[PDB]
Amino acid sequence: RKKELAIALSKLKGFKNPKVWLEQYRTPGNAASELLWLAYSLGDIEGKVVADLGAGTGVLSYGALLLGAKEVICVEVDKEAVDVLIENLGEFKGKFKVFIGDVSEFNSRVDIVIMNPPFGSQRKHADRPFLLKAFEISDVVYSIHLAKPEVRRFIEKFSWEHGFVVTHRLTTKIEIPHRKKLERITVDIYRFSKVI
């Protein structure tokens, strides 16, 4: 929960011109900190090859590198987001790679997946391609989703059908912001582990 990490993550540049249909909002520092600290504390970051699905501006990627990831592979469909991503990860040059294309087209096996995927509120089931890919390329997955009864039921069922079990689920409220009001939603930060 390191508030220092959250603070440092909040200093990164955001999206130039957010495409709402792609749910482009930078992962809030607090939620990002929670997910990363949890993964770090369980030994799922340091020295690991990490894939950041829907990397966007690179908040999760930066935090992972900051916490000792051996390397991070940033998967993002929008080039304009990658421009910001590259600048944000400037101090970790050579330690990250970028895959510009749809998440479903990426297929490199990694040690860990971390992601703040679209919840699927702008486009039906937009989050499924991310969960499917994450389950496909890794044995440990960290993701964020809407803390709603229907969503929770689905996530639990979907991961199971794909051979994964939820080992941790942390619930927090995030605020998605010239200068005005926040959209305050409650999300669950999940940690999935491949059965046996």
Ligand X SMILES: Nc1ncnc2c1ncn2[C@@H]1O[C@H](CSCC[C@H](N)C(=O)O)[C@@H](O)[C@H]1O
Q: Which residues bind ligand X (CB under 6 A)?
A: 22-27, 54-60, 75-78, 81, 102-103, 116, 118, 129
**Smallest separation, CB 146 to ligand X (Å):** 13
SS (H, E, C) 28-90: CHHHHHHHHHHHHHCCCCCCCEEEEECCCCCHHHHHHHHCCCCEEEEEECCHHHHHHHHHHCH
**Closer residue to ligand X in complex, CB, 23/71:** 23
* Residue 52 annotated as lining a ligand binding site: no
Distance (Å, rounded) from C-alpha 128 to C-alpha 178?
33
Question: Please, what is the minimum distance in Å from the beta carbon of residue 181 to ligand X?
Answer: 19
Does 122 show up as a binding residue in the annotation?
A: no
- Is 156 annotated among the ligand-binding residues? no
Structural tokens at position 180 = 């005005």
Q: In residues, how long is the chain?
A: 196
In the complex, least distance from residue 77 CB atom to ligand X, rounded to whole angstroms: 4
- Residues at the binding site for S-adenosyl-L-homocysteine are 24, 59, 76, 102-103
